[PDB]
Scaffold this active site. Structure first.
Site, mmCIF file in Angstrom:
data_model
loop_
_atom_site.group_PDB
_atom_site.id
_atom_site.type_symbol
_atom_site.label_atom_id
_atom_site.label_comp_id
_atom_site.label_asym_id
_atom_site.label_seq_id
_atom_site.Cartn_x
_atom_site.Cartn_y
_atom_site.Cartn_z
ATOM 1 N N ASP A 35 0.770 -1.079 -0.029
ATOM 2 C CA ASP A 35 -0.023 0.023 -0.123
ATOM 3 C C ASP A 35 0.827 1.355 0.019
ATOM 4 O O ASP A 35 1.308 1.773 1.224
ATOM 5 C CB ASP A 35 -0.855 0.054 1.294
ATOM 6 C CG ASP A 35 -1.717 1.300 1.425
ATOM 7 O OD1 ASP A 35 -1.943 1.904 0.373
ATOM 8 O OD2 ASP A 35 -2.544 1.405 2.606
ATOM 9 N N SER A 199 -0.909 15.388 -12.176
ATOM 10 C CA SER A 199 -1.195 14.941 -13.614
ATOM 11 C C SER A 199 -1.450 16.228 -14.579
ATOM 12 O O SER A 199 -1.835 17.241 -14.059
ATOM 13 C CB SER A 199 -2.396 14.074 -13.765
ATOM 14 O OG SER A 199 -2.806 13.625 -14.884
#
Length: 330
Positions: A35, A199
């Site tokens: 994770d 992004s």
């Protein structure tokens, strides 16, 4: 040194991925959920409340000759999906794919929430975010990667998750045969303890690319792709009959649909998520309503590039002095 381990979906939908981890002496192998959005290595154990164990493999520290109680230390964690666990702490030898750390904090669960109990395939979590998020008190502990880092050939790990198939976590090297083209690296902020990056935009299907900054985290422990409501609405508007359902808890779509791809930007590069990656199947057995793999982050407080996004790429988690993230097509 290096390590290399295969990671395997837990079910036919890729709801999560498990990776075998050796703990203790002799080795006890547990299947952990790696994770990159948390920083605790915790396990079902001989100390876990018996009614809260249902099929998991447990770590038994009393059977490990290298286990030592970390006296006075406790831990308690709550995840974004509402699940939780807590307990006490041992140090022991931990190996992943041939890479060994001695003195790793292994957090032994005394209590786990029902979501964990009900998932027989996940024996615990191995956190790979920054150690500043680790919950051990009063002495915070380091992640497996942080402990291994100085010994690694290069201070990196990579995630290469499969679509409905196994994939790979590598530590200490970049497998140049595992991706096509070049790796595009992008800046990371560690201020919140995550692999947080920005992004450069998105496209839906064959549509034009929209240049827009989307801050979010690369999180291997989250199943879906969570993005701003504007982006998500633009995606599902291209699927006839798709709608957001309060009762179901997000966007659903007719199971008869063909889903469009979704592209996200990494600098000037583009990662394409095929439409099929966005299908999470009937909401309940036999239903003709299917659950979407792109969902709104509104009210999560953060955008999350989870497995739906990451499995479309070869992803480098670069833990150099100034960390960065790399993405390549594959």
């Amino acid at each position: 040194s290096t390590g290399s381990a295969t990671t395997t979906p837990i079910d036919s939908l890729d709801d999560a991925y498990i990776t075998p981890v050796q703990i203790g002496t002799p080795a006890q192998t547990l299947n952990l959920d790696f994770d990159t959005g948390s920083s605790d290595l915790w396990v079902f154990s001989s100390e876990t409340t018996a009614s809260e164990v249902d099929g998991q493999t447990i770590y038994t520290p009393s059977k490990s000759t290298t286990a030592k109680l970390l006296s006075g230390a406790t831990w308690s964690i709550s995840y974004g999906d509402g699940s939780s666990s807590s307990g006490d702490v041992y140090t022991d030898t931990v190996s992943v794919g041939g890479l060994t750390v001695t003195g790793q904090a292994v957090e032994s669960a005394k209590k786990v929430s029902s979501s964990f109990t009900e998932d027989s395939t996940i024996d615990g979590l191995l956190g790979l975010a920054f150690s500043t998020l680790n919950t051990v008190s009063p002495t915070q502990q380091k992640t497996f990667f942080d402990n291994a880092k100085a010994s690694l050939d290069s201070p990196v790990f990579t995630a290469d998750l499969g679509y409905h198939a196994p994939g790979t976590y590598n530590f200490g090297f970049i497998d140049t045969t595992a991706y096509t083209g070049s790796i595009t690296y992008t800046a990371v902020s560690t201020k919140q303890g995550f692999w947080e990056w920005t992004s450069t935009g998105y496209a839906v299907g064959s549509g034009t690319f929209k240049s827009t900054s989307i801050d979010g985290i690369a999180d291997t422990g989250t199943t879906l792709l969570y993005l701003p409501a504007t982006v998500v609405s633009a995606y599902w508007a291209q699927v006839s009959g798709a709608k957001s359902s309060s009762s179901v808890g997000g966007y659903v779509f007719p199971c008869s649909a063909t889903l469009p791809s979704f592209t996200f930007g990494v600098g000037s590069a583009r990662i394409v998520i095929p439409g099929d990656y966005i299908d999470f199947g009937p909401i309940s057995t036999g239903s003709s309503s299917c659950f979407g793999g792109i969902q709104s982050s509104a009210g999560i407080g953060i955008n999350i590039f989870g497995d739906v996004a990451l499995k479309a790429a070869f992803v480098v988690f670069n833990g150099a002095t100034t960390p960065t993230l790399g993405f390549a097509s594959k």
